[PDB]
Write a protein that binds this ligand. Structure first.
Ligand code: CA
Ligand code: CA
Ligand code: CA
Ligand code: CA
Length: 400
């Protein structure tokens, strides 16, 4: 029947550098959690150990309504083989092939890897991928102030706690329409304390966290569309005023002009997207005010992108015939320098035995996953979490 422990022999080459790793792990067939330890049998890793992620056992994955095809095919002994190709933003490719054997509740996996065309000075070969960038948790006194100011705007009474009702109030002034229950979900995500509210430290964590799919620049570039009410690509006095009024702030004509000249870095009279990104990225009364309006939008949004758990990677699985599942995902690692390094994957599962009827009817499935890696030169500790969801309207949209 179902698995409890596993091992992995993963080997092959990355840009013609051979590697070989073995180790033992465990996991839970009821919630899809796994953990694995691996060690090199063949020297120090000469490339980012992160390229082995996510490749380093869907037999641990349950479906909403019972076993997944992956478990069913373990339980009855009939098995599946796996082929995965992953294409990287910089032109590299990686192929992995997998074969499994079962002895009761223990899985032995064999994974053969081939990656090529990683640029010699890119993040893979120069060991620059990471869990969390350099910069992380480093704050100037100015950033600490801005964050305290931003907290104040949310903490309406001044009691040092956010709470659902205040987040509602602020979000309403911004012309948003969250339900009680959505407010509940937003707070819960960010409330490590468990007291059903958001204090400054939890808030500063939410503001500082590196999101898997956006770097800070990309996040700010996104917010531009919001300030630019008519989508001309410029942000004008009338638009600065609309923005300032929703954060309860006034502005004379002089105050507005100052705000423009402050962001205006080519003297034209207009604020474009590049200039708007620059003002936020920098390092006077009016500067500070604008940055706060920008960050208010960033905050709301970070609060929304936590609830529909979108720091997870989302896979789309379909069944083209009764012995095949095809899964696709978009993937991102964090670099040292604070960037995202991106790729797409396609994985094909070949089953020996025709999949049961329910699986061929309930397609696509969406599977959300989170991984973690800690590594040395010779040794990795890996963890994965997984949850499967059925199709619904606009699932196929969380996925994109
Ligand atoms: Ca309060
Ligand atoms: Ca709390
Ligand atoms: Ca405009
Ligand atoms: Ca300009």
């Amino acid at each position: 029947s179902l698995p409890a422990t596993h091992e992995l022999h993963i080997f092959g080459s990355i840009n013609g550098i051979d590697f070989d790793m073995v180790g033992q792990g465990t996991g839970n067939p009821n919630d899809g959690y796994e953990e694995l330890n691996l060690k090199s049998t063949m020297g120090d890793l000469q490339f980012s150990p992160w390229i082995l992620v996510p490749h380093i056992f869907h037999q641990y994955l349950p479906y909403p309504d019972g076993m997944s095809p992956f478990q069913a095919a373990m339980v009855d002994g009939s098995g599946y083989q796996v082929h995965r190709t992953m294409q990287f933003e910089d032109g590299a490719t990686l192929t992995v092939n997998y074969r499994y054997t079962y002895e009761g509740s223990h899985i032995k996996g064999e994974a053969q890897v081939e990656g090529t065309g990683f640029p010699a000075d890119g993040p893979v070969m120069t060991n620059s991928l990471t869990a969390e960038a350099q910069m992380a948790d480093s704050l100037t006194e100015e950033q600490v102030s801005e964050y305290k100011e931003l907290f104040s705007l949310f903490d309406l009474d001044g009691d040092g706690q956010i709470t659902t009702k205040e987040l509602g109030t602020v979000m309403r002034s911004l012309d948003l329409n969250p339900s009680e229950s959505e407010l509940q979900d937003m707070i819960n995500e960010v409330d490590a304390g468990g007291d059903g509210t958001i204090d400054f430290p939890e808030f500063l964590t939410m503001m500082t966290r590196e999101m898997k799919y956006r770097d800070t620049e990309e996040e700010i570039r996104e917010l531009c569309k919001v300030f630019d009410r008519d989508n001309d690509g410029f942000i004008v006095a009338a638009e600065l005023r609309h923005a300032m009024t929703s954060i309860g702030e006034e502005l004379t004509d002089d105050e507005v002009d100052e705000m423009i000249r402050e962001a205006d870095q080519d003297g034209d009279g207009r604020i474009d997207y590049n200039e708007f990104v620059q003002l936020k990225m920098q390092k006077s009364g009016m500067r500070r005010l604008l940055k706060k309006a920008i960050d208010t939008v960033r905050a709301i949004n970070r609060l929304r992108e936590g609830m529909y758990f979108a720091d997870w990677c989302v896979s789309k699985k379909t069944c083209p015939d009764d012995k095949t599942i095809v899964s696709t995902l978009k993937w991102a690692f964090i670099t040292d320098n604070g960037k995202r390094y991106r790729s797409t994957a396609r994985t094909t599962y070949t089953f020996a035995k025709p999949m049961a009827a329910n699986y061929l009817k309930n397609q696509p499935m969406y599977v959300f996953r989170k991984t973690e890696l800690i590594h040395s030169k010779t040794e990795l500790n890996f963890k994965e979490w997984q949850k499967a969801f059925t199709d619904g309207m606009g699932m196929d949209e969380l996925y994109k």
